[PDB]
Amino acid sequence: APAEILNGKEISAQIRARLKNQVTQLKEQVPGFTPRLAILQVGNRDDSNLYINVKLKAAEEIGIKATHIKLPRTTTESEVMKYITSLNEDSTVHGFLVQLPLDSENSINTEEVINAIAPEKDVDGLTSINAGRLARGDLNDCFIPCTPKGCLELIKETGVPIAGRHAVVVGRSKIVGAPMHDLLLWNNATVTTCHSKTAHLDEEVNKGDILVVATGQPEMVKGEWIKPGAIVIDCGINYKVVGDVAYDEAKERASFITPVPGGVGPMTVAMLMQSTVESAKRFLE
Amino acid sequence: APAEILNGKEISAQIRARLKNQVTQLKEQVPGFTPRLAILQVGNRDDSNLYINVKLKAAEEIGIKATHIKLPRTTTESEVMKYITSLNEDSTVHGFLVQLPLDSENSINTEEVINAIAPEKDVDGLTSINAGRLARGDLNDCFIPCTPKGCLELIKETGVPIAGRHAVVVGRSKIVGAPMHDLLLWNNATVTTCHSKTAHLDEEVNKGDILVVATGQPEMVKGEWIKPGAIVIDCGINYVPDDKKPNGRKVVGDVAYDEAKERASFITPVPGGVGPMTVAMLMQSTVESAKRFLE
Ligand SMILES: NC(=O)C1=CN([C@@H]2O[C@H](COP(=O)(O)OP(=O)(O)OC[C@H]3O[C@@H](n4cnc5c(N)ncnc54)[C@H](OP(=O)(O)O)[C@@H]3O)[C@@H](O)[C@H]2O)C=CC1
Ligand SMILES: NC(=O)C1=CN([C@@H]2O[C@H](COP(=O)(O)OP(=O)(O)OC[C@H]3O[C@@H](n4cnc5c(N)ncnc54)[C@H](OP(=O)(O)O)[C@@H]3O)[C@@H](O)[C@H]2O)C=CC1
């Protein structure tokens, strides 16, 4: 009856187990070497503290050393830049990220802080250098944002080839929608990108053989709009916790669907660990 | 009720006249200020020499100081790198570009040469950093590659708002299709990107209220595919022998113009649509860079 559930909890546990074995093998080859991730937080939001704790738990399980630096809410852009520079120059740190959003009493230009991160350590894939490689199809060379990466792995778990499909991405943020569009295009989908100024969103969603939703508007994408047999990837986390897709209705139209929670969420953490292991391996290569 | 023709020759000439007036006024508001472009060439390709002469003559008519550095075919990659660093560090040069393709007897990594250009001076807009800013919506200060920048100016000359329209871009190159998608997306069109692996391309093109075609596939996009009333921008430059022309050849676009003009509301002819805008767009990006430096 209903769509096949893309179980992100199970898929991500498989990815984390493979990464744990790859890091154990790297440690056997170069005893004493330890892949290391740093997370820089500004402020003390409760949601960011919980998400960072999930990232630190996954890192510890895989065998990655993970450092959390937490700066106060009085922090300035200059003070944050100092910590980024320190991390860029610390040879023991292979990858690092800035947890977003920054929670400070002062105005801080997020793009400037993010673009101070060395591209080789930019495991969240948000620097303009990494975004510009991805946006132009240059994939040998770059870190891809973890949520889109996770979404692409979920779509590949269906076994249905992406090339030639019509994909619709709802949302164009730097963290999710814009890079998701690029991943699907460079995997040879024909891609439509919709956003808050799209007219007739229902008609555009209905064109989607693959549909990735990342709007942060609870259950806004109605099941009725889904193209029968579509693969539906829902990145929304909205407070019950619900996605950006009305799941009970969409599951009767899609072929494959991600639940919320347990879909994209766990895959994003697995993909950050995969990028961190790659950053350690590139360092060794 | 055929389409209105978007005359790129006349619109580019107006843009260049406005830029000239802007440059005169900047020079009078800030005595001594001298907007400056540099063009770095490696080797001596005839095609390159022709294109560079056009850009230099356009810069000087506007009042932009344009410097041409021509390095010999025996130049090595490290030599080109040193010149790019010097131009990055030269506070008198507000924008510069590397003429492609390089013509050297030595292997030179073109991607590494271009990505050595400081993003704040990349007037051609193809560094990965500039591409990343444009792709993520930083249109207030990034540089836009000239061909898509001239496509957008032609779309805006129609007077029809872009926001909320469904735009289709056929082609996804670094030079045209990919930056064109970003310009339409961040002008709030809903954008569909198509390419050589698109199935049912005609059905996709027929959804386009705005259509920009940049494939190099001569007259592939037939008139019947055009959505009635669309704005049709054709970037193609395709040569076809035609003994009835002065020079024995005609230029055709990537759209079958004769049938598409009966369907579109606005259309760019080929020749004379997108083509004539490109140098004016590079001069517009050079004045933008000079103004950002001035501030
Ligand atoms: N599990 C995880 O680890 C992650 C979950 N997410 C979740 O993904 C969702 C989106 O996050 P993020 O991308 O950062 O969000 P942003 O709020 O930055 O962007 C949301 C996007 O959705 C668009 N949008 C909003 N309303 C509509 C609408 N009515 N119709 C069409 N488009 C609309 C916006 O349009 P416009 O650009 O016009 O403003 C914008 O492009 C959130 O629920 C977030 O919590 C995100 C990252 C990670
Ligand atoms: N007037 C000017 O100064 C300029 C004119 N142009 C003209 O624009 C045109 C394209 O140039 P450029 O973008 O550099 O070219 P490229 O060859 O780099 O890119 C061609 C693009 O068109 C797509 N394409 C090719 N065949 C088809 C097809 N059959 N169906 C759908 N899509 C297809 C390709 O798809 P895929 O990605 O799948 O390979 C690719 O994305 C050319 O005619 C060029 O001369 C370009 C620059 C400047």
| DSSP tag of A120 | G
C-beta of residue B227 within 8 angstroms of C-beta of residue B263: yes
Give A163 to chain B, closest Cα distance, Å: 7
Sheet holding A36-42: strands in order across? A65-71, A36-42, A95-98
| DSSP tag of B9 | H
Would you call B128 and A136 a contact, using CB atoms and an 8 Å cutoff? yes
Same domain membership, residue B271 and residue B197: yes
What is the domain range of residue A78?
30-118
Please state, in angstroms and rounded to a whole number, the distance separating the CA atoms of residues B165 and B268: 19
Same domain membership, residue A112 and residue A63: yes
Within a domain: B156 = yes
Same domain membership, residue A83 and residue A187: no
Same domain membership, residue B226 and residue B188: yes
C-beta of residue A134 within 8 angstroms of C-beta of residue B128: no
C-alpha R_g of chain B: 20
Resolution in A: 1.5
Nearest in space to B237 (alpha carbons), one of B220, B257, B214, B210: B214
Token representation of residue A129: 């250098």
Token representation of residue A64: 């990655």
| DSSP tag of A245 | B
Same domain membership, residue B167 and residue B113: no
CA distance readout (Å), A93 to A66, A88, A90, B234: 9, 8, 6, 49
Token representation of residue B94: 């507000």
C-beta of residue B137 within 8 angstroms of C-beta of residue B161: no
C-beta of residue A37 within 8 angstroms of C-beta of residue A94: yes
B163 touches chain A (CB under 8 A): yes
Within a domain: A12 = no
C-beta of residue A95 within 8 angstroms of C-beta of residue A279: yes
Same domain membership, residue A110 and residue A188: no
Ligand at shortest distance from the CA of B268: 2
Q: What is the DSSP string of A256-278?
A: EE--SSSSHHHHHHHHHHHHHHH
Residue B38 burial (CB count, 10 A): 23
Same domain membership, residue B271 and residue B151: yes
Judge if the beta carbon of residue A172 lies within 6 A of ligand 1.
yes
- Catalytic site positions of B: 55
| H-assigned helices in B216-256 | none
Atom of ligand 2 at shortest distance to CA of B147? Answer: 48
For chain B, strand residue ranges (E) read: 4-5, 36-42, 65-71, 95-98, 166-170, 190-194, 210-213, 231-234, 238-241, 249-252, 266-267
User: Cα-flanking dihedrals φ and ψ of residue B141, to 5°?
Assistant: -140, 0
Within a domain: A91 = yes
Nearest in space to B253 (alpha carbons), one of B266, B229, B272, B278: B272
Please state, in angstroms and rounded to a whole number, the distance separating the CA atoms of residues A84 and A29: 30
Within a domain: B136 = no
Core vs surface per residue A154-166: b (16+ CB within 10 A) or e: bbebeeeebeebb
Atom of ligand 2 at shortest distance to CA of B176? Answer: 13
Same domain membership, residue B191 and residue B241: yes
Sign of CA dihedral B243, B247, B251, B256: negative
User: Cα-flanking dihedrals φ and ψ of residue A136, to 5°?
Assistant: -110, 10
Counts of helices then strands in chain B (DSSP H, E): 10, 11
For chain A, strand residue ranges (E) read: 4-5, 36-42, 65-71, 95-98, 166-170, 190-194, 210-213, 231-234, 256-257
Token representation of residue A89: 């120059």
Within a domain: B292 = no
Token representation of residue A6: 């893309």
Nearest in space to A147 (alpha carbons), one of A237, A253, A38, A16: A237
Q: Which residues make Cβ contacts (< 8 Å) with residue A34, sequence separation at least 6?
A: A27, A63, A64, A65
Which of A129, A172, A192 is facing B128, going by the closest CB pair?
A: A129
Q: What angle do CA A181, A186, A192 make, to 5 degrees?
A: 35
Token representation of residue A184: 């699907």
C-beta of residue B274 within 8 angstroms of C-beta of residue B234: yes
Token representation of residue B272: 């004379």
Within a domain: A129 = no
Please state, in angstroms and rounded to a whole number, the distance separating the CA atoms of residues A277 and A265: 19
Within a domain: B195 = yes
Bridge partners of B97, per DSSP, are: B39
Q: What is the DSSP string of B97-161?
A: EE-SS---SS---HHHHHTTS-GGGBTT--SHHHHHHHHTT-TTTS---HHHHHHHHHHHHT---
Nearest in space to B180 (alpha carbons), one of B169, B190, B188, B189: B169
Sign of CA dihedral A217, A219, A224, A230: positive
Would you call B178 and A136 a contact, using CB atoms and an 8 Å cutoff? yes
Nearest in space to A128 (alpha carbons), one of B149, B133, B160, B104: B133
| Strand-pair category, A256-257 with A4-5 | parallel
Within a domain: B92 = yes
Into how many domains does chain A fold? 2
- Catalytic site positions of A: 55
Mutate to test the pocket of ligand 2, among B6, B51, B194, B195 (most ligand atoms within 8 A of CB): B195
Token representation of residue B140: 């207030």
Q: What is the CATH number of the domain that holds B44?
A: 3.40.50.10860
Q: Which residues make Cβ contacts (< 8 Å) with residue A55, sequence separation at least 6?
A: A37, A39, A66, A269, A272
